[PDB]
């Protein structure tokens, strides 16, 4: 009912759940920060020099792996942490923890990657992506140069991010949008859709109001953003097909058990 209070509560939760916000990412990417700039990774040599400073060092033991595998393992490290952050955020969405525990799982199973790709755009420009909470920056050209199918994974996300960043959403817009994605009543296998839709109705109302107030000169920003939600699903589909190529062709490339659980029987 109180759409401005819901909006504010979601933003406060977002600030607590996600260490690198869009505001902070954009301050780094435009130099308007007093911390020292990210370490730029543009090739295998810069990767070896920089990886000791990057958070995914926590999981690096063993003989040297080729560059495409290192990137794969470090991105897997980040994806597992991102899932844990999004799950903490989801538990703050009012009504979410009162849903059937099995529907909570289903909402997260089908929603986290759509959310990951949404917020990945906050860390990207057309030429690279911030990693390790802004301590590193990995160039788009370097990620593209990786041998197939590794060099194919990031390009569709950069493409998405350039179009999406053109909406110029901020963190208070994004906090509501990602809640709307999680509360999607049409996920396969949901046991009880009505209470999920009721929550999303309120969230969609809160989002529409937020967008009208925060971006008065963008008419139909709300309509535009809703059309992106559906594009996110195609990104996941294509990503899954790329991971399946890895699974059938590479050796010793099993996924983290959390990522296996999400991907198992996904659609």
């Amino acid at each position: 009912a109180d759409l401005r209070a819901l909006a504010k509560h979601l933003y406060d939760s977002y600030i607590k759940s996600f260490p690198l916000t869009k505001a902070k990412a954009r301050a780094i990417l435009t130099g308007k920060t007093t911390d020292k700039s990210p370490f730029v990774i543009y090739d295998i040599n810069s990767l070896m020099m920089g990886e000791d400073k990057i958070k995914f060092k926590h999981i690096t033991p063993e003989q040297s792996k080729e560059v495409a595998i290192r990137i794969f393992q470090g991105c897997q490290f980040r994806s597992v942490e991102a899932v844990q952050e999004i799950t903490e955020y989801a538990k703050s969405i009012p009504g979410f923890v009162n849903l059937d525990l099995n529907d909570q799982v289903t909402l997260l199973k089908y929603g986290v990657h759509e959310i990951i790709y949404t917020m990945l755009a906050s860390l990207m420009n057309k030429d690279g992506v911030l990693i390790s909470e802004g301590q590193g920056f990995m160039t788009r050209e370097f990620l593209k140069s990786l041998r197939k199918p590794f060099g194919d994974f990031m390009e569709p996300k950069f493409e998405f991010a350039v179009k999406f960043n053109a909406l110029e959403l901020d963190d208070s817009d994004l906090a509501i949008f990602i809640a709307v994605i999680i509360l999607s009543g049409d996920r396969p296998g949901l046991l009880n859709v009505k209470p999920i839709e009721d929550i999303q109705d309120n969230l969609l109302q809160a989002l529409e109001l937020q967008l009208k107030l925060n971006h008065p000169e963008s008419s139909q920003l709300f309509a535009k953003l809703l059309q992106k939600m559906t594009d996110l699903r195609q990104i996941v589909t294509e990503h899954v097909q790329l991971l399946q190529v890895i699974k059938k062709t590479e050796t010793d490339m099993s996924l983290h058990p959390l990522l296996q659980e999400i991907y198992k029987d996904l659609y």
């Binding site: 899932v83 844990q84 799950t87 525990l101 799982v105 997260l108 058990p257 959390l258 659980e261």
Partner: peptide, 11 residues
């Protein structure tokens, strides 16, 4: 054991 449930039920 579901790991998503573990994250969801964690304090």
């Amino acid at each position: 054991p579901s790991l998503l449930k573990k994250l969801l039920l964690a304090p």
